[PDB]
Symmetry: C2
Subunit: 85 residues, 2 copies
């Protein structure tokens, strides 16, 4: 019960850590890439927690979709960073 809230909270504080290190970036394109990647990783964590503790099928469906999509956009921003600035 409260175990779900902590797992949610753990993924959040995890995302906050990396997102903090990405906004001190000066180049706003690099800041968007690094920040949204950490932000997207937060979605995946929050979605995986829902798959563990969630009971509602519609939301568990959305969580599965969110994991698939965010992972995709993440690999794009990663490739964008390996080539740019």
């Amino acid at each position: 019960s409260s175990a779900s809230s902590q797992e949610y909270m753990a993924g959040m504080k995890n995302m906050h850590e990396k997102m903090m290190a990405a906004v001190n970036e000066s180049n706003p394109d690099k800041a968007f890439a690094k920040g949204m990647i950490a932000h997207h990783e937060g979605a995946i964590a929050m979605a995986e927690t829902e798959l563990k503790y969630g009971k509602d099928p519609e939301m568990r469906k959305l969580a599965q979709d969110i994991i698939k999509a965010q992972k995709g956009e993440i690999e794009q921003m990663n490739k964008w960073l390996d080539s740019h600035k």
Copy 2:
């Protein structure tokens, strides 16, 4: 290395603002006991952060690929926000 660079640009400030806003709303959303409801409220606040970060990118960003992604992200996140919003207004 430069001392006057010890202050953030406007773009970094807007990015910082969107984070502090997203964290606040997400904090108030994990207070849910029901994890399905917690996922909905939390991902909504989390998704709104994506929109803010993408809007900040559209305001200050120059790279075409990333500007396109920011545009798409705003569309998709808003849609999924509407889904979770209706899900919250309909499920108990």
